[PDB]
Design a protein around this ligand. Sequence first.
Ligand SMILES: Cc1c(C(O)=C2C(=O)CCCC2=O)ccc2c1C(=O)N(Cc1ccc(OC(F)(F)F)cc1)CC(=O)N2C
Ligand SMILES: Cc1c(C(O)=C2C(=O)CCCC2=O)ccc2c1C(=O)N(Cc1ccc(OC(F)(F)F)cc1)CC(=O)N2C
Ligand SMILES: [Co+2]
Ligand SMILES: [Co+2]
Lengths: 380, 380
Amino acid sequence: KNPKSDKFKVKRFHHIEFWCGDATNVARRFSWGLGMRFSAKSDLSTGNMVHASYLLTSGDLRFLFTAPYSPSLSAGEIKPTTTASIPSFDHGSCRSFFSSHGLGVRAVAIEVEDAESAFSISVANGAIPSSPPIVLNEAVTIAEVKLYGDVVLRYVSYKAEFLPGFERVEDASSFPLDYGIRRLDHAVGNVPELGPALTYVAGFTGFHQFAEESGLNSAVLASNDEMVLLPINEPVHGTKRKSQIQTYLEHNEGAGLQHLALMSEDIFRTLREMRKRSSIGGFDFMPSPPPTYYQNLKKRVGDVLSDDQIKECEELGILVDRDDQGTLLQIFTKPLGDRPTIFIEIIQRVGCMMYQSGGCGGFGKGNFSELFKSIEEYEK
Amino acid sequence: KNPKSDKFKVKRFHHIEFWCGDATNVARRFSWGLGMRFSAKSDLSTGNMVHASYLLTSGDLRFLFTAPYSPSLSAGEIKPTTTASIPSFDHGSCRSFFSSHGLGVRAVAIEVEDAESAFSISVANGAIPSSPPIVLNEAVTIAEVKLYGDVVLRYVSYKAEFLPGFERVEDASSFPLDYGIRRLDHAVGNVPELGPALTYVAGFTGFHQFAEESGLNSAVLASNDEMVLLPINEPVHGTKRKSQIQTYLEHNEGAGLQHLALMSEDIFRTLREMRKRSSIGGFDFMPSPPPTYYQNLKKRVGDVLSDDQIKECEELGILVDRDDQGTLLQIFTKPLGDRPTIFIEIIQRVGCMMYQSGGCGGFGKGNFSELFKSIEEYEK
Ligand SMILES: Cc1c(C(O)=C2C(=O)CCCC2=O)ccc2c1C(=O)N(Cc1ccc(OC(F)(F)F)cc1)CC(=O)N2C
Ligand SMILES: Cc1c(C(O)=C2C(=O)CCCC2=O)ccc2c1C(=O)N(Cc1ccc(OC(F)(F)F)cc1)CC(=O)N2C
Ligand SMILES: [Co+2]
Ligand SMILES: [Co+2]
């Protein structure tokens, strides 16, 4: 049941912004590891004396990496005279965020019809304001409200090239890397208490609950066409094996974004390319399931995937889950940085053709039990 | 003239330590960009609840990348019970350093015969103490004094594998990258006033002055065998074109390490490999000289380098300088991070065979004028 209760018009995920200590090194690492190209910049060379911001793109996926300069470079400025291209940026907020949480997602940005109205309606409906609507060059409006922890939900709306003040990147620096990633499928938060988190976010967005012992309870909020998907997890406590949600909250100093799920047009090629680069600057992947897991795949998805396609999953460590509607291929990186906090999921969905409807195949929750079984079975 | 006046026995450069916001992402970027392998770690997986530290090696070159965890993980600890493998580490010092200077070198470490005696003699002779001598596992002693700005000179001495508490890295993560870099040739500081900086450092080390308008004055301090080389620069002010030393001091919030010079066993192969990777996660290089610079090379080094070897320099943007003793091939990266502060130099030296004596060919100071001339000549 989709009651289509969005309180404002939401379009798609727009971008994800990482707050960094050094944006250059994080962005270069991510670019090589994920196959995203450098597409825009806002920094000293564009007249920004406040923050360094670099944009990577792959298909429709946009990753933004931002770090503060010395406040001394902009000490003469006031907000009316700022050279920052992202007016919500604040040196002290950014340093406090990074000291508290380490490397992670500050902003989950969605494109909306009218960011000012989305902001007003959100706050009218319980949203805690974070940055008021600001119109950039009479062309783009941006506004921010609190989502969970120190993560903000950022609204962006265009009258009619990322943001004013960003420059498109010189082709010599823009190497056309592409490993097949195409868009953000969902963005997931970890919180101490799921109930209040859900009530708050669904309260101010109108997002509805999307239809669904090892660590967590979770629920998923979705926009009208279910293309914006925001799962939220809470720990289950005292569980024999320690909850990965609780470990997150400890090392992150509280709630924050747990993982970003990146849809690939060809997950086999994406994983081949990412795995070639794991030990030369890219990303590592979580330990693969035992062969029993892939022996058990035939009985569960043998009508969706051929033997060769199942064997290809086994080579790459890919996990498979299935719903009543569709099938999900997925795999998880190790944490992106020093702390066991944020990681990335690569996914591809099979089914639900209408275009493909959102959330086709679910989020892989069936893989908790099927993994656990596989390990005890393989213990043989 | 080498009066060999070291006040304690100094051996070689040992390692360079970067203080980072996220050590994982900086270390992965540097590993790919410079061809250094992951050789040791000290982090949560080794029982360190204080800091994440990763060591890259190439030949004798050791780069250490360190970042703090949440203080909350180690809140119960006191220095006698610390899980930190580097006892001089301090959460607050590290966050203050990074907020103030951005990504950069905290420690220039040299191996000495006896770090405790080097520390005592240094402080007896004017050195400002930074961290007192601490013996690690009855095997290694480490101590630190202030060098310039917030950079420390770290003494390390071994009774008889990097440091106790570091683990050697799992071979699956240790991809044997190697682009030819072999050791640290020299480490260079920028200061507001050269005179007091020289007097201070030469005062407590016994290092002697090593024998030598566009931006700077400089002087070089050297150990007895001139294998530890510490150049120091100061700006020249009001100079038509802005001093790169002054730009450094502005963006770095004062004095700090300007560049690390990395000797290559084969600078042509190193530059080929680094340049292939510039736009896919590695390092960029400063703008190459015009062809007039390479036309003028024949008259200056045609007895050292063949036409093919000179043409190979031209393909790679390599600079050449020469002394009365030897010849220097060199080239400079763009800044390593967001701020126009620290960069890296790749070098190879020809001549001074005895082994090769240190500083053979100088530091490239003749390339300031020869570059400037080349640009005006090429303006034609
Ligand atoms: C984050 C995550 C998702 C996931 O995407 C979401 C959502 O999107 C929304 C709904 C909640 C949800 O969680 C889906 C599957 C998943 C993980 C995952 O984090 N992990 C780490 C992990 C845990 C337990 C473990 O032990 C064992 F139980 F044996 F596997 C080993 C690794 C491992 C793992 O295996 N799967 C299969
Ligand atoms: C740091 C540095 C060294 C260097 O290693 C040291 C030492 O080790 C110890 C002794 C002091 C010393 O400086 C040597 C050569 C060098 C640079 C350098 O930083 N730079 C940037 C730069 C400046 C001016 C410029 O304009 C023009 F003058 F036309 F070139 C363009 C780029 C450029 C450049 O060209 N050379 C040739
Ligand atoms: Co997921
Ligand atoms: Co140099």
